[PDB]
């Protein structure tokens, strides 16, 4: 499992973004108590203590805590960083009132196997009211995707599997969100913002959302589904522009890549054609650590065969 | 709206079915043995989508009992009805230890039981439970023979950058990671031209006679270098052989670097020493494998080696060492 | 006969410019002369002769494109100097039985495949003035070890399951199929050797059914899956002048003839220094003279470490058609 | 040769359509007799026999029947499938009466080197009147194509070739039908149907057709000629939707690709402009396997620059 | 020893060899000059084809080599050579009929002997005399290079823990000489200027040129790729030998000169970039070039006005 | 950035200074550090970062102006003082330094090596038993197999597109070539030529002469000697010293190695020996250039009996 840590540490956009945020707020860190929710190898705890901090408490329920203790001694921070192995709820913090909370909580569709719940638990139970959260703002976005070649190959396969008809797998494949990096040139509609979350104020009840969206076709192509992603923003001192980053196709590689959702219809689009729709995202009733996604869309066109191209449909996707 | 009542991660079954070497080797074996399948009861241990159960029913069999502990059994039920086999195939959801079989005696047992270093998250254990409790004595097991092998690998370019990353992570010294990475067995496809020693066979298991105690094995091996190269560790793999009628050649396949692609790929185990070899030099050694104490599902591997050479530099290049690795 | 084939031969800059720059080097041998173009097609070589000085050029070809050639020679200012005849040279009434120079683009895919060599020999035998010049005059077949494991395992394993059925009997058939394709330099992993050379001034039809030996030695560790074959071409020349020559091999620029690959039945595991010694025979067959029976026999020998386990001896019969 | 067999078997649209159609009709197959005209490797015969048939008789005039006999032995259908080497007309069929006839008779522009003829001989001579043909309905279609960049390379190359004027090649190229797959986005007009054939009624004389078409422009582009194709339709039980497939550009790849014909004029077109005209198709006198195709058209522009872009022309083409 | 890279460049070496051969009958009883002699081949290839006598100029220990070479291959009596800048140096001859020169560099004009070849036609050439080559031109088109610029500019964010960000504008202003693969070209290629050596007066080399590129497909235009095309002389009516150093032509040691824009432009098929590139050799060092690019990128498509952008970039070839 | 992007991306070099400095962080702690040839300021920054009362970064390139900007950003302005120009001219805020850290090493160790400036600093500014980073270094050579590449740049001048251009081949055969000599292409017993200790060495000792013996590993052509250097750092009592090699047998450093091609492409056999002499001195025409000369004798005692046992001299100019 060191692999997810080599993968997370080698994502320079992620780690440098936390680094640069902590440096921009170094004097806000200066003599404060820091909580690292989901510390991993302790890299963000070592940045906090590196840029001045009275003490950082880093927590995580994984074995890598024992490694991170070795790392925190090797780099001379053993006095300033305490690492606790466990889930935040099961752990007694040595200073119950924390000034800053830093956490790399985000998951694949922002909310997929995210630690957001544990971070809002942390702010609600240990943060000093006007306390700083790193990052504190985020948003989910989408746009139309061209993926004809791959999607037809993925769905054609099940027509004959060694002679047996495997057609019942085709709807199963359409119901599955794919996490993959999309080539920018394949994004073929304008992008829209679904929802936004302010971690200073948001309650867990607001994570189950429902949103409206409209995408306008940028060029003549097929829209086989949507590609979604998220953007991140960090706190900043008065006046300064904040450190931010994006996980979308129009931005550099991030280990979060993008999450693709395939539509049931392959839409035939001309420039200016329009997809208006709605996406709902809710934790599943049977299992809250899985996500029920539903996408409804109205592909309205008009040009010569406009009505023979116009399509309205919906899809339900399950993420797990 | 569509209600989500099912686990199915389609991707992992697509990976299994698109492995042509794996699935065509079970198909070809069943075809070679179709007459021996004709009025028999077949048990599919770990049926997944039911594909091998369907191969069996297609090739004449009184009945197939497909067993698996994953939600894919309800989809697999759908595939059995669509291909006309609902009356001949019975699928059960659960672990074989628990479920209560419809037919007290199985004549043939088919299973894709193999894990990454043959034995890593394998269901060998459950196949042996099945022949011991349900098979008719001289009954056929598909596959029934397997064997683990190794040889020296040249990986200097990738090993060096994996290890050199940890010397400075954004300013911090991350050197303690280096021993952790050197002892994580990697599952990857090795390029055949990077294999630079002769191969050796560590162990063989005949599933018709093997008891669970033997899966924890200790074995010695010797490797001679084919060409002048750095040997950075070993590449390991396994070969499978299927039962065969009197006089036909048995169906077989290898997951080693010298064979076509397979999803089990190979397991690489890195040495602490990067060895400077010359044509003719040697690695004599020992590999021991055992499920461990604090978790019998994870594999403790130990590899001991002694690399020796005679070409002038001979003693300056020779070296011995030991290592423990864990697959999890 | 379709523009395509003719656009192809004309876009192969190596082929046509090699005949151009060769005829230019011999223009002083040309100035007074009469020349015969075997298989002239769009008349390009004939017009090259005329353009560089010649009393006449008689161009022959059995395909409809001959008609198109006639407009072209009218259009390019050569109508008086170039005479064109449609049909088979053998029986189509040659209007000048004493030719000084004869040019032809006779070459086929493994040099001899659907090759006009038999018709070019008939023309020197029947119309050339003894020490008369042929373009080109010398050709030679060559071969080397090829690495192509990825594509070959895909092509053959496809036949194991065809929509549920077993199409395994198709694997021996693909394996005896010589494929024409361009081989990237880097997949050539042995030395190259010469099989057979031909001197067009001297060669008789009899010799075109040949038998020859070759030794390839491995340049690096690799799997050798078969041989990649090709030909080199040379043009006649005046003394003091080095001949214009071209190769159709993987180590030379693209030519429409590409290379002709033959797959072995064994995939040879080789170490640097190892060797393949073999024999290739070639004979045009009874049931269709234009089709070729090729047979390759080899002994892959190795002295390195595992030697005899790796070393292979085997035979393979291939059919070009 | 092996090649066209690899190309026909690897075409999943083709084979799977015959597969699916036979499965839909499997009850009407059940205990009957079927003839496979042009059976090649025997794949269709094997589908029929696999889905229930007292007998499949497979005919073909190619050396491949000695191979297909081995494939039927290897695949366990030897008592039910009987293969015969030769041109249908004179071969001695084990059965006088056939219940079902399946064949893969189609050629590049449907009718190009087609064995349709032989299939009609087989229904008129051996089919039980209301007997089923697979497939029994097919149709040729067309639309305007944008090919400017490639066509100008192919017609301008002929000017200066090594110093020689090769211009007379230009009309020769411009009247060469090309078989190539066209990308969806280069089809710039509405599509129209030329002709339709019902294989149960069609007499040979009807293949020498002459028909009209109207093509309305979908967007601003150069129309350099027409892309043509064909659609196939399989017989079905009443209540069941027929298995069908298309070989056109807005349908997945198939080995028949499309057959492009180039126009003598490169038409300049705005959204809404129109190509009206005619296509005539007839076998040639000296060799009836060759096809004389002529296309006549009038492009009238109703898009602002009307008269300057309006063009009328004719072109004869030959398939051989 | 660098001169290997010069003579090993076949599209340079052979292009001159075949270009001299096409004009052989016009070299005949005449006299030639190998200005900027990069070892002697142009004087050696020239002499060997009729031209009664040649003269060679190179300011480096390499002409001591050229003199020896002329003897190992016979030539000595027909070929005369020297150490020095042709501006004021003298070998045994007064005038010349054809000047043969391997003068150009990188942005056609950077470490080039162009002024020195202009010196020779203005002082020793017989008015209607032959210059090899006589015509040249610089071109540009737009480029997709997103991953390499994003990684090249990301390195400086973390050097062994320290922030090295002041290096980013510096490398953005570094015009890179490399081979662009043709598929990364994403616009129509334009012509900035064209020179003719038989007429081009020295001052003319400090040019200010306007260009226009239209986008050929959707992409990120990250900057410009520049290159040049060479054309040689020929007898009345026949094909001039000619070659190019551009992305869609076979490899050349001059490669292409990439200039990165300050903005990574998002373009759709048909979007336009209108600019002006100026090139002035600078005051402190007349072998170092000041390159400045002004550009206006417009779009009439779907979100056209937001993506449209104009800017300036100063660059320094040094 | 050119030369700086390469220097800083050299992980073996930079990391050897980092790890040697962290090993020694107690001895830096409240001390005064002279950084000879600081460049971007990265080693000065390593010093300040690991406890230093002050660092004086000196260098004569425009790059000092950047080093001041980088010294600000990372938090070191108060601890790092940067001086533009040469040491002897520009003068230091502190009279005496406790530690001198410098990346002085050139291509054949001594090529445009700042050895002389570093020694000027321990002789004029370092406190007697003061620490020098690095403090020990050694030049080394081995036998090379470079057949293909050498025969490329040789035979090509025989028929340079028709002409005989070969008086080049002796020139090319004597201008030393800097390149990463592939590990597998080395075929003799790597011998120690000479070493220097920066605490004790005085400029005069750099014009050397040395003793070498090379036992051949295999039967192959010993085309030239490939030569390289190893570095070692000052270390505390009982600690393993930080060290590294530019050797072909070691990872890529920016210095790679300097190849010396032989006139005679020696055909060797497992067991036979080259013995001889190497002399290295600076030049009168220019005190920065290096005059190298190689005296080799090949005793081919083996498969040839005594037949290809040749002996030859070599004069090479590094420029």
Swiss-Prot record, chains A, D:
Residues 1-294 form the SAM-dependent MTase PRMT-type domain. Present with 37600 molecules/cell in log phase SD medium. GO terms for molecular function: histone methyltransferase activity; identical protein binding; protein-arginine N-methyltransferase activity; protein-arginine omega-N asymmetric methyltransferase activity; protein-arginine omega-N monomethyltransferase activity. Belongs to the class I-like SAM-binding methyltransferase superfamily. Protein arginine N-methyltransferase family. SUPFAM superfamilies: S-adenosyl-L-methionine-dependent methyltransferases. It comes from the Eukaryota. The active site is at residues 104, 113. Its main location: nucleus. GO terms for cellular component: nucleus. It catalyses: L-arginyl-[protein] + S-adenosyl-L-methionine = N(omega)-methyl-L-arginyl-[protein] + S-adenosyl-L-homocysteine + H(+); L-arginyl-[protein] + 2 S-adenosyl-L-methionine = N(omega),N(omega)-dimethyl-L-arginyl-[protein] + 2 S-adenosyl-L-homocysteine + 2 H(+). Its EC number is 2.1.1.319. It is found in: Nucleus. One of its GO terms (biological process) is negative regulation of termination of DNA-templated transcription. The gene is HMT1. The lineage of its organism: Eukaryota, Fungi, Dikarya, Ascomycota, Saccharomycotina. This is Protein arginine N-methyltransferase 1.
